[PDB]
Structure 1
Amino acid sequence: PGIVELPSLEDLKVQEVKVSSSVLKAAAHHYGAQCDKPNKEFMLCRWEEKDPRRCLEEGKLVNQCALEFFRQIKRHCAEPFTEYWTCIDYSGLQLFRRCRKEQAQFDKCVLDKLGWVRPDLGELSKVTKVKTDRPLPENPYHSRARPEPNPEVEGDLKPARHGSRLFFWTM
């Protein structure tokens, strides 16, 4: 019965930050540090209104923020971040005890030329405030109101009427 409407490729023609996930995991704390403040706009939009085809322009927003962060880490300090991800690349599933020395060198890089202190464990937690330009939504489950409440029979009980009203044995 009910057909849908789905958006075209008019907004789905967007370049992506197509790097591997190993180097992205290597850039976890830092990308979570400076950027990823207005991606919680997208997160709040999605967990309030559970619609994809709703919050997609904020998907473009977080995509261009990650592109900004990647150009910033590309142009500025440094080059041995390349050494860092090719160090942590072949360690099966990545830990952070694996390539610690080059992690410390990249720390010294980012601290001396830009800043960006690594957040302490476990600060990447701790449910976080966000305000939007949109107002917070309403009735997101598309149904009507609940049709009939039970008519609550009230009033205290009257005494017994004509005894039992069975075949006999009144009282």
Structure 2
Amino acid sequence: PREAAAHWVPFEDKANMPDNVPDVVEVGATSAPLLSASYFIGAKCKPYNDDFMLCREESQGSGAIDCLKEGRRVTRCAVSVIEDINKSCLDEFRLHWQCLEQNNHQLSGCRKAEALLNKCVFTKLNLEKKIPGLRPDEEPVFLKKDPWIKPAVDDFKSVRAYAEAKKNGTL
């Protein structure tokens, strides 16, 4: 909660989780893949994440040890989402998060690869990207045409792929 300052020393511990806790696959995705697939892991794994945080609320200060069984399932279902999005559109997912590698991981600077990825995942993985808390007669911001805030440099691969998807008629 507070930052380490004044000569902090990093240390690691070679040790293992005990016998009674089963093993769990951990997420190997990085900040641009994770920020890319954030909306789709939030769309598929809403009740599991909600179960985890609601358990952690109900057992106060228990915290760590007593809702471990449910933090298993949130990691498992998000790994399921990212495996499925790899096998579905590895190329356009890659186009998206390689765009997000530049521009400070700003989501504002990568709209034209984001449209391709959202179409490809809604077509095949059939998850939709939505923003809740947004009452009607308020346009969602990744749908609007001529935004005020445009990126400095459109990346070249996604402009070319966006024009090719115009020409194919899939868009």
Q: Are residue 88 (structure 1) and residue 89 (structure 2) matched?
A: no
Among candidates 65, 73, 81, match of residue 85 of structure 2: 73
Residue 119 of structure 2 corresponds to residue 108 of structure 1: yes
Match of 1:57 among 69, 86, 98: 69
* Partner secondary structure for residue 110 of structure 2: coil
The 5-angstrom pairing of residues 4-153 of structure 1 reads: 9-10=18-19, 11=21, 13-50=23-60, 51=62, 52-92=64-104, 94-122=105-133
One-letter code aligned to 2:106: L
State the one-letter code of the partner of 1:83.
Answer: L
Change (3 A) 1:26 1:122: farther
Task: State the TM-score, normalizing by the size of structure 2.
Answer: 0.60
Amino acid at match of 1:72: D
Kept after mapping to 1: 8 A contact 2:24/2:76: no
Deviation at 1:12, TM superposition (A): 6.8
Deviates more, 1:51-60 or 1:18-27: 18-27
The one-letter code sitting in structure 2 at the alignment partner of 1:109 is C
* Contact 2:86–2:93 (8 Å) recurs in 1: no
Q: Give the distance between the partners of 1:104 and 1:115, measured in 2 at CA.
A: 15
Paired with 2:90 and 2:121, the residues of 1 have a C-alpha distance of: 8
**Deviations 1:107-140 (CA, angstroms, capped at 9, x unpaired):** 12122324322213545xxxxxxxxxxxxxxxxx
Decide whether the 8 Å contact of 2:89 with 2:120 is kept in 1.
yes
| Alpha-carbon distance, 1:26 to partner | 1.3
| Contact 1:22 1:89 survives alignment (8 Å) | yes
- Which residue identity lines up with residue 111 of structure 1 in the other structure? F
Percent identical among aligned pairs is 33
What is the CA–CA distance in structure 1 between the aligned matches of 2:123 and 2:24, rounded to whole Å?
35
Which shows bigger deviation, 78-87 or 108-117? 108-117
Q: Which structure shows the bigger proportion of residues in helix conformation?
A: 2
Structure number with greater Rg is: 1
RMSD: 2.1
Q: TM-score, normalised by structure 1?
A: 0.60
Q: Say whether the 8 Å CA contact 1:84–1:102 is kept in structure 2.
A: yes
User: What CA distance in whole angstroms lies between the structure 2 residues aligned with 1:114 and 1:64?
Assistant: 17
Shift of 1:78: 4.3
